[PDB]
Design a protein around this ligand. Structure first.
Ligand code: LMT
Ligand code: LMT
Ligand code: LMT
Ligand code: D12
Ligand code: D10
Ligand code: D10
Lengths: 177, 49, 240
């Protein structure tokens, strides 16, 4: 190294913190960012399954694809709660009412992107020939991650939000203006 | 800008915090010295007879 | 060249998925144009920063496609929605639409840079590898936002078909009609479901916590390496 090693935790810890901070500013809230951060695991599980089931390894290619997968599931979660939060705030719509109207408005764009990207990386996962080692490594991580993140997030995000909204509010959950 | 942040105290905080930890991080990596390089560089030619 | 090729295939595959949902040539063409615009611009940014075209930057391009195409989809879809939720004409619909998401797109790019920048900071030999991805991907996202604020809206306002209030092609004859019909019902099925998960909830934190321990479980198991050995069509034999 040697010269020392294992910088991963530090840099991802700070990465985690900056993301929370950016989300705090985005929502003007210290608590709502969690209803987005909680989705991180949802893509990682899939990336881990595919890698393991395929005999792959935790390497550069696996790390970067995961960040990408986390990025997108973060982006989907952010737009969802951004829609739910606005409906409540701008319009009067109450918690549930808005969480469901948002998630429903968000389902399609989410599926369009997931399947476009999952299909897109298929060539990589299917790759043979020069550099297929790298190509396979990149593709299978992203494919696994995108699948779980996609299916899981569309259900878990609306949850994350109401649980978080309820745990850190005052009034309320009823329609209004 | 002030009016913007008067209604968005949290966003104001975020900028200040991000700036602070950027500086904390900077402090770990920054070299330490009495002075920076201030002497002008010299080259010496040495020969013997 | 093999990565360039999958890059092209990925764009073709994207176009076909876009078409499945947008069900129109000119609409599918919008996200399909955004991609090559951002990617090509990225090469320019790489040059301005003295990077080279290498395995890592090329894969950054590939991964960027997911981020890129998503910016475009989000913009175009939201207009398509607006237009079907009001019957606003295309030009008017994107204006309303852009004003609605424009701020989020920019905000999201910033939260995202927070997830990719940090790796530009690994130390040693290692660090130079991760850095290729950071800059490629972060740059691409930046350009993607620019493009989403400049080309995409312009393209949306001129190439999108007027949609009538309430129309969801649900009454189109052929595959689309059946697909359009299938998606709506499935959507309601989706909303219904979520509707029930919210009436409960404690059962799903349990699930989450399973997934999380599962995740952590698999992680500590998965061996770690750096870069794979490639068959490069050559090798040597030492004789001593
Ligand atoms: C805002 C959300 C962001 C979420 C980010 C979380 C995703 C990232 C998780 C994967 C990171 C890599 O995971 C970890 O990487 C380091 C190296 O970098 C590995 O460490 C091992 O491999 C490398 C290889 O040179 C060595 O530097 C290191 O000394 C060695 O022990 C760990 O064994 C591995 O567990
Ligand atoms: C829409 C998708 C956008 C993504 C596309 C990305 C493509 C990636 C290409 C990487 C490899 C190309 O590598 C590069 O190719 C060009 C031409 O093809 C070469 O350039 C050479 O060929 C052409 C002619 O054929 C001459 O104009 C040029 O003067 C000459 O130097 C470079 O010397 C080579 O280094
Ligand atoms: C080193 C310096 C550190 C600075 C780092 C910057 C932090 C990251 C910024 C992310 C925020 C997203 O981007 C910004 O967020 C604010 C936060 O409410 C949002 O603000 C949005 O809602 C408010 C009202 O509540 C509107 O007045 C505003 O016009 C609108 O844009 C915007 O969508 C967007 O302009
Ligand atoms: C009542 C005001 C609460 C504002 C909280 C600010 C938090 C500052 C954190 C400093 C972190 C270095
Ligand atoms: C980085 C530390 C930020 C802490 C913010 C806490 C805000 C609590 C106010 C309710
Ligand atoms: C990173 C720690 C963030 C703490 C946020 C606490 C939110 C309290 C809102 C009342």
């Amino acid at each position: 190294e040697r010269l020392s090693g294992n910088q991963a935790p530090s840099l991802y810890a700070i990465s985690l913190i900056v993301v929370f901070l950016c989300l705090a500013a985005l929502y003007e809230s210290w608590s709502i960012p969690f209803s987005v951060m909680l989705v991180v695991p949802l893509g990682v599980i899939g990336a881990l399954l595919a890698a393991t089931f395929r005999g792959l390894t935790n390497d550069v290619y696996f790390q970067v694809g995961l960040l990408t997968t986390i990025g997108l599931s973060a982006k989907n979660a952010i737009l969802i709660v951004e829609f739910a939060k606005d409906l409540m705030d701008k319009e009067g719509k109450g918690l549930i009412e808005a969480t469901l109207d948002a998630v429903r408005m968000r389902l399609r764009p989410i599926l369009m992107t997931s399947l476009a990207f999952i299909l897109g990386v298929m060539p990589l996962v299917i790759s043979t020939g020069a550099g297929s080692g790298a190509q396979n490594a990149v593709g299978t991580g992203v494919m696994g991650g995108m699948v779980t993140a996609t299916v899981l997030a569309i259900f878990f995000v609306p949850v994350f939000f109401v649980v978080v909204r309820r745990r850190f509010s005052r009034k309320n959950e009823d329609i209004e203006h | 800008m002030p009016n913007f942040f008067i209604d968005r105290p949290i966003f104001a905080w975020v900028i200040a915090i991000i700036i602070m930890l950027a500086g904390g991080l900077a402090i770990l990596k920054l070299p330490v010295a009495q002075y920076p390089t201030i002497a002008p560089p010299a080259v010496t030619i040495s020969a013997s007879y | 060249h093999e990565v360039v090729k999958t890059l092209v295939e990925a764009i073709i595959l994207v176009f076909l998925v876009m078409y499945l949902f947008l069900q129109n040539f000119r609409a599918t063409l919008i996200p399909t144009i955004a991609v090559p615009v951002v990617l090509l611009g990225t090469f320019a940014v790489l040059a301005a920063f003295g990077f080279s075209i290498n395995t890592l930057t090329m894969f950054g391009m590939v991964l960027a496609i997911g981020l890129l195409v998503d910016d475009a989809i989000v913009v175009v879809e939201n207009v398509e929605r607006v237009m079907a939720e009001e019957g606003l004409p295309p030009k008017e619909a994107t204006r309303k639409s852009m004003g609605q998401i424009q701020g989020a797109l920019v905000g999201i790019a910033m939260v995202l840079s927070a997830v990719f920048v940090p790796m530009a900071f690994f130390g040693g030999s290692t660090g130079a590898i991760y850095r290729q991805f950071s800059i490629t991907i972060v740059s691409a996202m930046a350009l993607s936002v620019l493009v989403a604020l400049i080309l995409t809206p312009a393209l949306c306002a001129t190439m999108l078909k007027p949609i009538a209030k309430g129309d969801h092609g649900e009454g189109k004859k052929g595959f689309f009609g059946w697909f359009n019909r299938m998606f709506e019902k499935s959507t309601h099925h989706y909303t219904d479901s979520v509707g029930g998960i919210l009436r409960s909830t404690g059962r799903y934190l349990v699930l989450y916590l399973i997934i999380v321990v599962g995740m952590a479980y698999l992680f500590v198991r998965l061996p770690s390496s750096f870069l794979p050995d490639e068959d490069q069509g050559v090798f040597m034999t030492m004789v001593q």
